[PDB]
Amino acid sequence: NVTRRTRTGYALMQSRKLTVTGNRSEQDQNYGILMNYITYSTITGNFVSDVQRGDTGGDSMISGGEGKALFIYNSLFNTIENNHFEKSSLGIHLTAGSEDNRISGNAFVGNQQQVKYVASRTQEWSVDGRGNYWSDYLGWDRNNDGLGDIAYEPNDNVDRLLWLYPQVRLLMNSPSIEVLRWVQRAFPVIKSPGVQDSHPLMKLPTEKLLTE
């Protein structure tokens, strides 16, 4: 499917055992993939780009209206994998309870904030040693194919810096900043937004479905 210039690309509401493989959402608005209580599903292949916010006229929706590539909600059991979420105002918004969901092989590029996990439980989005491309991921692929050594613990602030100022990655690859980060991933600073991909990805998957 192809949804362009909408106000919600895909509203997958209150359902079961569906397949949303191979779809494609273009410059939508306020939402890319809204999933409520969507269980036992095989979400794959989707592509969400530039989900603009609610900005028309002289107004600002303070602390609201932020676009979302994937609004995943209450959906305990899915098989989300091989999806490309790009140029959004947020991705993989995860509220309610979504434990036992299998997330892997996705691609999150150029997001203002890649994840907004809120639950007080720990959930690893890496099934069988496969994480997500995680553009914000800062460095470290020393083994040739070891997908990654640092687990992608999301920080909202660094995501904002790495999008507005894209050169900051260079600034944060200096050995001094590197050892500072080595000490900030050992003695926790900023309480752990729980999500943590033990095996993030350095290669960019979903290259087949970029432009088709």
Partner: protein, 275 residues
């Protein structure tokens, strides 16, 4: 003994040289930057959680302080010989080892007073301007950090004296000092870790935790991270030996033992120096 006279002239050199200002100013910039300007790697600009600062600052110190000590002390012996004032000094009723210990105590007091001054601007900088820190934990943590940093400064001073006694010219002394600096930080860690990972899959599991004593840079890191500090989860390298080299005074004794053997080595080399 007459040792205090030589230490006094070294301290006087410290004031007449921008060294005492330079070491303390830059070291205090280090300390203050890690607390306010530091932690910005995660985007949280300013906070002074005592466990973090005394660990990141600890690693930046385990790099900076050995280099500073080596730069101070590499030319203590060779520099005098090239200057032409060494032959005059030996004519005085001073033992070769006596002047060596005098120079050691002088440079050590230079760096100790320097770190005390530099963190003294830092220690007030946190306490007065931070919001609600338990001053006691801050005090004992920075106390262990001050004493560990000055002890590492002393051990690298002693290394500088041994290499200077071995060497013949100032530039070659600086080269050997740089080699000794690079070796401990970047190579004694890397080669040792590589050692476990491949030389030792099951070759000899039991030996690797203890060998980290040989390197003072590792001992220093373990002392300053492990501590009484809460949430004491150690990442790679330290975690082997973070759990148990059986210490709480053993590491301190080992660091002092390194300084001791190095001072004896310097006395031995400097005794046979001439011709």
């Amino acid at each position: 003994n007459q040792v205090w006279n030589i230490a006094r002239k070294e301290l006087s050199d410290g004031l007449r040289n921008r060294w005492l200002l330079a070491i303390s100013l830059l070291f205090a910039v280090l300390a203050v930057g890690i607390a306010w300007l530091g932690a910005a790697a995660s985007g949280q600009l300013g906070f002074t959680s005592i466990p973090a600062t005394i660990a990141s600052l600890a690693s930046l110190a385990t790099f900076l302080m050995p280099l500073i000590a080596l730069l101070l002390a590499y030319d203590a012996i060779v520099g005098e010989d090239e200057g032409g004032t060494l032959m005059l000094l030996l004519t005085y009723p001073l033992g070769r080892g006596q002047i060596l210990l005098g120079k050691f105590v002088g440079h050590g007091l230079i760096l100790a007073l320097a770190v005390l001054i530099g963190f003294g601007c830092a220690a007030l900088a946190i306490a007065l301007l931070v919001e609600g820190v338990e001053l006691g934990m801050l005090f004992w943590a920075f106390g262990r950090f001050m004493i560990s940093s000055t002890l590492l400064g002393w051990v690298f001073l002693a290394f500088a004296y041994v290499l200077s006694g071995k060497v013949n010219e100032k530039s070659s002394a600086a080269g050997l000092a740089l080699g000794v600096w690079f070796l401990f930080v970047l190579v004694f860690d890397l080669v040792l870790l590589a050692l476990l990972v491949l030389s030792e899959g099951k070759f000899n599991p039991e030996l690797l935790p203890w060998l980290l004593l040989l390197n003072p840079t590792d001992i220093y890191r373990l002392i300053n991270l492990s501590g009484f500090e809460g949430s004491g989860s150690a990442m790679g390298v330290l975690s082997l030996g973070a759990d148990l080299p059986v210490p709480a005074a053993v590491l301190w004794l080992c660091l002092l033992a390194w300084i001791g053997v190095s001072l004896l080595l310097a006395y031995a080399i400097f005794r046979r120096r001439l011709t």
